[PDB]
Amino acid sequence: AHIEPRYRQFPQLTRSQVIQAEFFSATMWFWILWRFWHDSDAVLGHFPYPDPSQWTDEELGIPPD
Amino acid sequence: RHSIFAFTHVLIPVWIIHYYLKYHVTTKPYTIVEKKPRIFPGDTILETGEVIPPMKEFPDQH
Amino acid sequence: DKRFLKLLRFYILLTGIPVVIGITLINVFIGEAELAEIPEGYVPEHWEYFKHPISRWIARTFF
Amino acid sequence: DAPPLTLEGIKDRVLYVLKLYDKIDPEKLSVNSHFMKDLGLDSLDQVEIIMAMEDEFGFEIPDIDAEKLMCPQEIVDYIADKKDVYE
Amino acid sequence: MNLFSSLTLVTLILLTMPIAAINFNTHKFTNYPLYVKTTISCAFITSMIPTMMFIHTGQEMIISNWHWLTIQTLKLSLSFKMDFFSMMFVPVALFVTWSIMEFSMWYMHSDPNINQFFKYLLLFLITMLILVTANNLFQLFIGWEGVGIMSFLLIGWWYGRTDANTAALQAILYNRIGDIGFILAMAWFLINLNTWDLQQIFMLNPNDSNLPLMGLILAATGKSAQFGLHPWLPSAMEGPTPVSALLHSSTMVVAGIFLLIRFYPLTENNKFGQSIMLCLGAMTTLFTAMCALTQNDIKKIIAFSTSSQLGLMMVTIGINQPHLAFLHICTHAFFKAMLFMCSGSIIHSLNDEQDIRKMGGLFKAMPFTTTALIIGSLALTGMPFLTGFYSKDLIIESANTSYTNAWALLMTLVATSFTAIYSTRIIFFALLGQPRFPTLININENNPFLINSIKRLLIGSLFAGFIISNNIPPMTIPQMTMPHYLKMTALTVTILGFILALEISNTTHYLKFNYPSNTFKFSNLLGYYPTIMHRLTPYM
Amino acid sequence: AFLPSAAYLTHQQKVLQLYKRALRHLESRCVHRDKYRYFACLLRARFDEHKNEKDMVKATQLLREAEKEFWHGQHPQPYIFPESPGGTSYERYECYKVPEWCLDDWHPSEKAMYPDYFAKREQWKKLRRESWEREVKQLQEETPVGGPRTEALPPARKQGDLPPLWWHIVTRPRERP
Amino acid sequence: SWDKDVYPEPPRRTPAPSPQTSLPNPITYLTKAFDLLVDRPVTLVREFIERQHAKNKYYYYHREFRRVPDITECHEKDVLCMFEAEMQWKRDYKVDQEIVNIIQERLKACQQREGESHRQNCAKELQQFTQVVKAYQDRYHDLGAHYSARKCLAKQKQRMLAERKATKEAA
Amino acid sequence: SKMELPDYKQWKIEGTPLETVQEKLAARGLRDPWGRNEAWRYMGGFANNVSFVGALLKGFKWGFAAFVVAVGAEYYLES
Amino acid sequence: TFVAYLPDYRMQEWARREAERLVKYREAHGLPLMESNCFDPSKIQLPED
Amino acid sequence: ITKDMLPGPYPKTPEERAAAAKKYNMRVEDYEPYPDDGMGYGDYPKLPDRSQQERDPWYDWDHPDLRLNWGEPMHWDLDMYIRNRVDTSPTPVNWNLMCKHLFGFVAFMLFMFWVGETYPTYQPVGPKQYPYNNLYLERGGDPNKEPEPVVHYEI
Amino acid sequence: GAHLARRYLGDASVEPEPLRMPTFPPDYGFPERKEREMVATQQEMNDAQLVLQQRDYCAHYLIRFLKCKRDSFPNFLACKHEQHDWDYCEHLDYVKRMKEFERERRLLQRKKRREQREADMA
Amino acid sequence: SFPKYEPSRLASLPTTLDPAEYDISSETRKAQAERLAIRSRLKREYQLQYNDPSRRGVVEDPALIRWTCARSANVYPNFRPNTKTSLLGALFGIGPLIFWYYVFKTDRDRKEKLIQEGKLDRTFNISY
Numbered sequence A: 001a002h003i004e005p006r007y008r009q010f011p012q013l014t015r016s017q018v019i020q021a022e023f024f025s026a027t028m029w030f031w032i033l034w035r036f037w038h039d040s041d042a043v044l045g046h047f048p049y050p051d052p053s054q055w056t057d058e059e060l061g062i063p064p065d
Numbered sequence B: 001r002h003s004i005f006a007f008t009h010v011l012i013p014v015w016i017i018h019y020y021l022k023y024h025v026t027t028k029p030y031t032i033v034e035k036k037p038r039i040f041p042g043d044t045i046l047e048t049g050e051v052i053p054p055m056k057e058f059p060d061q062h
Numbered sequence C: 001d002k003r004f005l006k007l008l009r010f011y012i013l014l015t016g017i018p019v020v021i022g023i024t025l026i027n028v029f030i031g032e033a034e035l036a037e038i039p040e041g042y043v044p045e046h047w048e049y050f051k052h053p054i055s056r057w058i059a060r061t062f063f
Numbered sequence D: 001d002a003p004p005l006t007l008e009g010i011k012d013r014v015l016y017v018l019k020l021y022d023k024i025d026p027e028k029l030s031v032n033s034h035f036m037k038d039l040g041l042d043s044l045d046q047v048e049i050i051m052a053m054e055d056e057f058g059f060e061i062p063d064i065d066a067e068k069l070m071c072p073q074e075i076v077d078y079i080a081d082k083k084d085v086y087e
Numbered sequence E: 001m002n003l004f005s006s007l008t009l010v011t012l013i014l015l016t017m018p019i020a021a022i023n024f025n026t027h028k029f030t031n032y033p034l035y036v037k038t039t040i041s042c043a044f045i046t047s048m049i050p051t052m053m054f055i056h057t058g059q060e061m062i063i064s065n066w067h068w069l070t071i072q073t074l075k076l077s078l079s080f081k082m083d084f085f086s087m088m089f090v091p092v093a094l095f096v097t098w099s100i101m102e103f104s105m106w107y108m109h110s111d112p113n114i115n116q117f118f119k120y121l122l123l124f125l126i127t128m129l130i131l132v133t134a135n136n137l138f139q140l141f142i143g144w145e146g147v148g149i150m151s152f153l154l155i156g157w158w159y160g161r162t163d164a165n166t167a168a169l170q171a172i173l174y175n176r177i178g179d180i181g182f183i184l185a186m187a188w189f190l191i192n193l194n195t196w197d198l199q200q201i202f203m204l205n206p207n208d209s210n211l212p213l214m215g216l217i218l219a220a221t222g223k224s225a226q227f228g229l230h231p232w233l234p235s236a237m238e239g240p241t242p243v244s245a246l247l248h249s250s251t252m253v254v255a256g257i258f259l260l261i262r263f264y265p266l267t268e269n270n271k272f273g274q275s276i277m278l279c280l281g282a283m284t285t286l287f288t289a290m291c292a293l294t295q296n297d298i299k300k301i302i303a304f305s306t307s308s309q310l311g312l313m314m315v316t317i318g319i320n321q322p323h324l325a326f327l328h329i330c331t332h333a334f335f336k337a338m339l340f341m342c343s344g345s346i347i348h349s350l351n352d353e354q355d356i357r358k359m360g361g362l363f364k365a366m367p368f369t370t371t372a373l374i375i376g377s378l379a380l381t382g383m384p385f386l387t388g389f390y391s392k393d394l395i396i397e398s399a400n401t402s403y404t405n406a407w408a409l410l411m412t413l414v415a416t417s418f419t420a421i422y423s424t425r426i427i428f429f430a431l432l433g434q435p436r437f438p439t440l441i442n443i444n445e446n447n448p449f450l451i452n453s454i455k456r457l458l459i460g461s462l463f464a465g466f467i468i469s470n471n472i473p474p475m476t477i478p479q480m481t482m483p484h485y486l487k488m489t490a491l492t493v494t495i496l497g498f499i500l501a502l503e504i505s506n507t508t509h510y511l512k513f514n515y516p517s518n519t520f521k522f523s524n525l526l527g528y529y530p531t532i533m534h535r536l537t538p539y540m
Numbered sequence F: 001a002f003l004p005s006a007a008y009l010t011h012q013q014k015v016l017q018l019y020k021r022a023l024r025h026l027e028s029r030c031v032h033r034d035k036y037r038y039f040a041c042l043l044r045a046r047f048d049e050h051k052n053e054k055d056m057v058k059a060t061q062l063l064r065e066a067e068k069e070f071w072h073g074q075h076p077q078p079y080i081f082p083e084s085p086g087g088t089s090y091e092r093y094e095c096y097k098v099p100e101w102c103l104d105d106w107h108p109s110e111k112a113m114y115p116d117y118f119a120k121r122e123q124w125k126k127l128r129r130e131s132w133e134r135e136v137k138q139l140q141e142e143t144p145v146g147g148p149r150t151e152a153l154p155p156a157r158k159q160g161d162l163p164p165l166w167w168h169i170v171t172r173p174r175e176r177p
Numbered sequence G: 001s002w003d004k005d006v007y008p009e010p011p012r013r014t015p016a017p018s019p020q021t022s023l024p025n026p027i028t029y030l031t032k033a034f035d036l037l038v039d040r041p042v043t044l045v046r047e048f049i050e051r052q053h054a055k056n057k058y059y060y061y062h063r064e065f066r067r068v069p070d071i072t073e074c075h076e077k078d079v080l081c082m083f084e085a086e087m088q089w090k091r092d093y094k095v096d097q098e099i100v101n102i103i104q105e106r107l108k109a110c111q112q113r114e115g116e117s118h119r120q121n122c123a124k125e126l127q128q129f130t131q132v133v134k135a136y137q138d139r140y141h142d143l144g145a146h147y148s149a150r151k152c153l154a155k156q157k158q159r160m161l162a163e164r165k166a167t168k169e170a171a
Numbered sequence H: 001s002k003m004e005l006p007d008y009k010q011w012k013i014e015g016t017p018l019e020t021v022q023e024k025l026a027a028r029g030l031r032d033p034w035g036r037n038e039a040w041r042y043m044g045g046f047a048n049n050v051s052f053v054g055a056l057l058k059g060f061k062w063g064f065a066a067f068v069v070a071v072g073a074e075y076y077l078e079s
Numbered sequence I: 001t002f003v004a005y006l007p008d009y010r011m012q013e014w015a016r017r018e019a020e021r022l023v024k025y026r027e028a029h030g031l032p033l034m035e036s037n038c039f040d041p042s043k044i045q046l047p048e049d
Numbered sequence J: 001i002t003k004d005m006l007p008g009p010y011p012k013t014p015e016e017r018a019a020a021a022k023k024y025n026m027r028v029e030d031y032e033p034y035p036d037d038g039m040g041y042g043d044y045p046k047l048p049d050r051s052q053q054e055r056d057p058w059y060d061w062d063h064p065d066l067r068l069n070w071g072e073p074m075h076w077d078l079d080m081y082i083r084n085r086v087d088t089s090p091t092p093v094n095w096n097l098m099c100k101h102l103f104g105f106v107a108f109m110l111f112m113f114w115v116g117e118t119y120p121t122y123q124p125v126g127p128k129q130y131p132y133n134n135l136y137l138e139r140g141g142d143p144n145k146e147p148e149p150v151v152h153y154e155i
Numbered sequence K: 001g002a003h004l005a006r007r008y009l010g011d012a013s014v015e016p017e018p019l020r021m022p023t024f025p026p027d028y029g030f031p032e033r034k035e036r037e038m039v040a041t042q043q044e045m046n047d048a049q050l051v052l053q054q055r056d057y058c059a060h061y062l063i064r065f066l067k068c069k070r071d072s073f074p075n076f077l078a079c080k081h082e083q084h085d086w087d088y089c090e091h092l093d094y095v096k097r098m099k100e101f102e103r104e105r106r107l108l109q110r111k112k113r114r115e116q117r118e119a120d121m122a
Numbered sequence L: 001s002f003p004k005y006e007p008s009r010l011a012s013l014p015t016t017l018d019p020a021e022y023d024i025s026s027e028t029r030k031a032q033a034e035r036l037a038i039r040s041r042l043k044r045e046y047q048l049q050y051n052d053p054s055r056r057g058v059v060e061d062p063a064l065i066r067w068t069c070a071r072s073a074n075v076y077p078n079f080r081p082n083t084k085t086s087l088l089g090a091l092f093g094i095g096p097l098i099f100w101y102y103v104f105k106t107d108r109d110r111k112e113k114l115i116q117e118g119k120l121d122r123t124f125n126i127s128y
């Protein structure tokens, strides 16, 4: 049976549309947290950015005068 | 006669278009020109059999 | 409008389908020619310089 | 989509809205309860009733027809005139 | 070679076959939309084999099959280019088109001109695949004017309406003003490089290409609705919702961007053209994403959304990162077609309601549409590890960590904030809160056409960004070293957009009425540009 | 100003049209329905403060500055109902509103596809072509000199007359053809 | 078949298939399916057509224009000789147009065939293209829509007077 | 064809923000005439709707549950 | 059908096939593919100066 | 149809003006023509130059898309003031002030892009160093000649 | 991003301008500094058809990653080791460029101290 | 107090702000009733031809026919040379001709001076 038109009230819900919406919402959060567990680096950062002030004058070749 | 859609829309057009491309297009120069396949060190050529020598051993960073 | 379109398809296909079938049979059974070098002494006809048979017939009959 | 309307449905929905109005009682209200002579209403109340009809059935009644619907049955007849019910 | 070129041409000839089917009809059809939909399904399934054998071998070719015309030095052949751009965009566009037409079998069921509608929409698909496979500028002009004229015929679909006809004439006006620059580009290439073929243009490698690149920027300004030539994309929503959904989200409006992406070996040797593209893209993505925030018609908002994303594409071409821009095309297609299909299901279930101020209560009432609309809005914002992440986050990271205009980069980030603002504006005023629609509820979404058509783009908007960004071979060096405040620039600006727009949403429930300032009056009248230039310039 | 039957708007009609436009632009500004309802009763008190104004100079002046209050306090994009002028569906289906006279030019084989419809239609055409001269002689005896004043058409009076000029008012195409 | 000496194509070198992963690719199964379902019946039909060709074999010829005297040895305002000179010049102009088109086909095919290393590995095709465009610009450019052997001769003579003046002023 | 209406008496505004509006109109001496015409939007199934931070987290529960089960299966799978 | 099978309309197919013959001839013989002079400079007299 | 319902030359006497206002089917006091300057209007009335979009849409018009009647003296630019064309409808913000807002915003943004190009931003790194004389043969250098040694060392 | 405020609000002479740098000689301050080594042969990366922006000093990791992705199809998640090797070596090249910029900056600090000593001594 | 709306030509004045709408004087009543009279006469005379079944054709509009005759036929007898017509015909008849003439003449003289000095890049221009 199709959705009966209703008046000033909440419409009829099929079981299938609600379980599909919940399944794809849970699949979205499964994918987000799944890649967040496997990658964890495309968001936060990959490689440690060095501090240019903490480099010594020996490795940068700065003879003192 | 259940899936004659594919038979009359792919399998007969694949026949016509492959007959066209095989005996009138490739028979003419530079109609189908192909980017040559990407060659890596250590590969084996199917045409000659000349094996490309590999890379130098790496100054290992890790 | 449907009568015009039905008659349009009919009076085009009425000689379209026999000409398409005739061209197909020429291409299968008579067929495209092959380029040969001109023999010594042999002066060809003007219609013999063309590759397709229908082009040869047009050059031989009318042109 | 777009469910077909009847005169009975338009009548019942207009009277259902007019029974949800606080300056109209739901027991004196009939199909010809004239809004000025009977129900003790302002013309401002008439304008609010026609605007509730527009918010109800989802189409704008123009002012030259809004200012003249003086009973619920004229409203039923005008929505039947502009929606072509009982085709 | 034998299989690749075969299936390449079979997809195009297969798509041309239902045009012959509708032109050679006598009867009334046994669901000719099912015929066109099944044609597009099998064309997608056919075209995925050249995609797979390009991912494996890296195989590309040119099909210059049919000699057409030879003007003394210019052998114009029917020349197809099966490169990375064609190999990635043809199955994406076929998939999005297949979703839109299974949407249209439901949404346009009340139409007795359904066969004419599907005929026009398949003609648009054919002209777009002429556009994206063109190896010379004459065939690309064919596909370009084809998408322009089918834009005319589908904007002016309900043709008795004056607004549709006006929007269609407006759309043709802006597209032909872009065509001025496109013809300027073709004229420069014929007079200076003696070719329309792309191969000889890339081989000769011109240096003083300021004039043809200004022509191509004018062409992309006409086609991709950049600033100056934008207002046809707001007006273009007066066509059907599947017309806007297919064309003016994912398929038509990317063609100027796709034109500039096609000529990246010309943009990579000109700092002037890239500065113009960066300035124009940042100007567009500020202006359109600002004008998106203060609209109430949902199709106006999603049109300004896709124009802001096209301005972002123009930015990330102007920073000389073209393959990320093409990834942003192939990313933006899925979720923006899905957001138009969700907005159109809200339109249909509420009996032609396109306004957000008469929505609400559709979280529970339309659960699958609300779910997919939140997913599309999060993919639009740049949620981590959706499809929008793998393009837009890398676009922000490569725009920060490169030689860039500073003010253009700041405008790109302000646009990144405004995206989250209108995304949660759509989510709030459309799905959340309480209902504001009239009292006769005809909320229904139980058709397998609608459910499957949103479902396939939903699988796409989840997985396809990951799948594409790990199946394509790399083309530049990705910048993957940057500090914590600069790697996390995009997500910080996105979350600030979320929180500030939530505070704007909480200010909608307070019982105080404030008089509107000039900011809202400026942005709500679209930045006054359809007000001045449409009343003054036709008068002149 | 410009109306078919009346030649003007009265002061009371201007006040009602201003009240209606003020509530609609308020509902535009005040999106949520409880907030609209609160400011709606506030605006109702604002209009009913001066309900009993017998000075027509004072009433028209309050109307004038109320118009100026509306003109400063309006929204640029009100909510337009879609089938209303300015909407997203106004005059959309005029591409399907084919008039009735095009049925007269059909081929008789596809009139023979609906036999009962055209047999039923010819008696409508018969009733129109007999009622036409009766309603012309109804109009020419009731209309005063120098042309009619209003555009209000008269009704039918006899038991056998149909109202004058009734064809394109009844035989108009539907809103969903 | 065309001549590879006028349309140069290098020896192709394809890599040998190296399946490292345990999953099979779809491309070998689809290549077997193509090579059985499509490549063989089309070849059968083509062999039938080829047999019907070979049952009646006949030939066409490339037309050979023997060289008539050109415009430099034709009298002024003598149409019977400069007619043949003009027809000779127009055939040579049309053939030179197609020569420039052949070198453009070489250039575009080289650019596609080399791919990303096109700027390094097509210097000879680009060099031949620049030379043939230089010769065609020196030979036929700017003659106008009423081009003839007289216009071409006058352009050549003005070019030779410029060359002679530039050489003589360098001594 | 005959559509059955709901009751006009069951839609009462008490407990809804229309009643809060009635209180804030009685605070300065007014009265609301159109409350029960709007009170269905705040009752029935449409009442107690979610906010934005939960409408994001739709599917977070079973998504995180199946995530935990899949992490456990892949960590017991490598051993 | 008639326009489709014109017998080499304005000899363009002949011209391409002749261009193939000429480039095949003068790629083997070490000749340039096209002279910059349409006619032999030995058979052109310049105006003296 | 005949001559006296087709427009003629310029009316100069008041009775010719009265006959012309009877011709265009409007009041004589409403009748105002274009001035006799030779630009080619004749006795055609100078209508108040309003767009057709301004009119009452809800009226039972004769011409529904044009918002126009039978016998009503049409505007000279009636084709120009169709609803598919130029509109004269009132806007909230004034025309002068909208032009000032749009031009000020355009000039402001273009000035800021110009200054940002004048003061470009970058990242604190060196140049991207390439081997083989900064890729000499790959960028199109000739093999017979030989470039300068572009050599980069270890840091 | 503080260096933009050091070059635009402070001075420009002690900040090395990116468009023409290094301006100091590379042997100035480095006794016996060795050259950079290219692992991938020019003929190899010509056969590999790498992009001209991709043909830097560490093209060999990218050649191995592309060979992996060709050889692991249809698995597109079997080449993270090669991708991480290539991205870490690009990280090292980016750090070397940072060290070149910081070398130029500290040598401009050295020249600033030199000229201040000359202005304060003679 | 409030921003007074400034009317423009391309954005006119509203009725509800125009001061002539609140005129209740008797001559305004007479004008509105006479305009009602002529409008009702035209409406009635139109719908007497619009609803007649014996008519099968075009209800001719002498307003529309009069307009199309004014746009095309009545131009020439009322065209008189004065200051305004002669000056606007001089500026808008041959003015942009002179502008584009000196633009294209200057551009072609510059390009010709470049070409016969051999300064212009014309390396692959062979299609003209």
Ligand SMILES: CCCCCCCCCCCCCCCCCC(=O)OC[C@H](COP(=O)([O-])OCC(O)COP(=O)([O-])OC[C@@H](COC(=O)CCCCCCCCCCCCCCCCC)OC(=O)CCCCCCCCCCCCCCCCC)OC(=O)CCCCCCCCCCCCCCCCC
Pocket (backbone or CB within 6 Å): B015, B016, B017, B019, B020, B023, C012, C013, C015, C016, C017, C019, C020, C023, C024, C025, C027, C028, C031, C032, C052, E009, E012, E013, E016, E017, E020, E065, E066, E126, E130, G041, G042, G044, G045, G048, G049, I001, I004, I005
């Ligand atoms: C069917 C009826 C349809 C309707 C008919 C009526 C049509 C309307 C009226 C028309 C009236 C005439 C008008 C004038 C035109 C005259 C014809 C003409 O000029 O032809 C020119 C031209 C030259 O023909 P030709 O000079 O005679 O022959 C060339 C050689 O000299 C000689 O070449 P050849 O000798 O080698 O060729 C011989 C050929 C005969 O020649 C012909 O057929 C040509 C004559 C027909 C031409 C028809 C043209 C009309 C338009 C057709 C297209 C539209 C149709 C409607 C729409 C359909 C849906 C799209 O033989 C065959 O066809 C046999 C092979 C069959 C292949 C298929 C099956 C193979 C496998 C079988 C397996 C099963 C058995 C296994 C076991 C076997 C055991 C033994 O012919 C064509 O162009 C033919 C059309 C097809 C071309 C290729 C199509 C695909 C191209 C794809 C890429 C390009 C498009 C990209 C689009 C992108 C998106 C937009």
Ligand SMILES: CCCCCCCCCCCCCCCCCC(=O)OC[C@H](COP(=O)([O-])OCC[N+](C)(C)C)OC(=O)CCCCCCCCCCCCCCCCC
Pocket (backbone or CB within 6 Å): B016, B019, B020, B024, E065, E066, E067, E068, E069, E076, E077, E078, E079, E136, E138, E139, I013
């Ligand atoms: C689907 C049913 C079809 C009909 C059924 C029966 C026939 C089926 C076909 C079976 C195979 C037959 C043999 C193969 C076909 C013929 C082979 C052959 O040599 O053909 C000769 C040639 C091949 O090219 P060619 O190079 O030999 O000839 C060019 C012509 N000259 C040299 C004179 C200049 O023609 C064709 O094959 C025509 C194919 C046309 C395909 C594209 C159509 C485009 C339509 C739009 C036109 C405008 C384009 C604008 C853009 C241009 C580019 C910028």
Ligand SMILES: CCCCCCCCCCCCCCCCCC(=O)OC[C@H](COP(=O)([O-])OCC[N+](C)(C)C)OC(=O)CCCCCCCCCCCCCCCCC
Pocket (backbone or CB within 6 Å): C052, E016, E019, E067, E123, E126, I001, I002, I003, I004, I005, I006
């Ligand atoms: C002629 C000058 C005066 C002008 C006025 C003329 C009026 C009188 C009319 C007289 C008759 C007509 C004369 C002109 C005829 C020209 C046609 C002709 O002969 O063509 C030859 C061309 C010849 O092609 P060709 O130039 O490659 O030549 C091949 C050479 N032969 C045949 C010798 C090998 O015919 C064709 O191309 C026909 C091929 C089959 C049809 C095309 C296949 C695709 C069809 C369209 C599919 C859909 C495409 C996408 C569109 C989708 C929807 C938008």
Ligand SMILES: CCCCCCCCCCCCCCCCCC(=O)OC[C@H](COP(=O)(O)OCCN)OC(=O)CCCCCCCCCCCCCCCCC
Pocket (backbone or CB within 6 Å): E166, E170, E173, E177, E180, E214, E217, E218, E221, E227, E228, E229, E235, E530, E533, E534, E537, E538, E540, J084, J085, J086, J087
């Ligand atoms: C990289 C470079 C980038 C540069 C960017 C900046 C430069 C370009 C600037 C924009 C130029 C075009 C815009 C001006 C014209 C806009 C016309 C238009 O859209 O008109 C719309 C109007 C009605 O539409 P509208 O009112 O919006 O609808 C809502 C409901 N009324 O419709 C109408 O009124 C109908 C009008 C029909 C007749 C129009 C006649 C005028 C034609 C003018 C041509 C101008 C040619 C300019 C050539 C420039 C060459 C360099």
Ligand SMILES: *C(=O)CCCCCCCCCCCCC
Pocket (backbone or CB within 6 Å): E400, E406, E409, E410, E413, E485, E486, E489, E492, E493, J121, J122, K001, K002, K003, K004
């Ligand atoms: C200094 O920070 C150098 C980086 C480039 C110039 C400043 C860029 C500022 C925008 C990026 C971060 C935005 C964070 C909200």
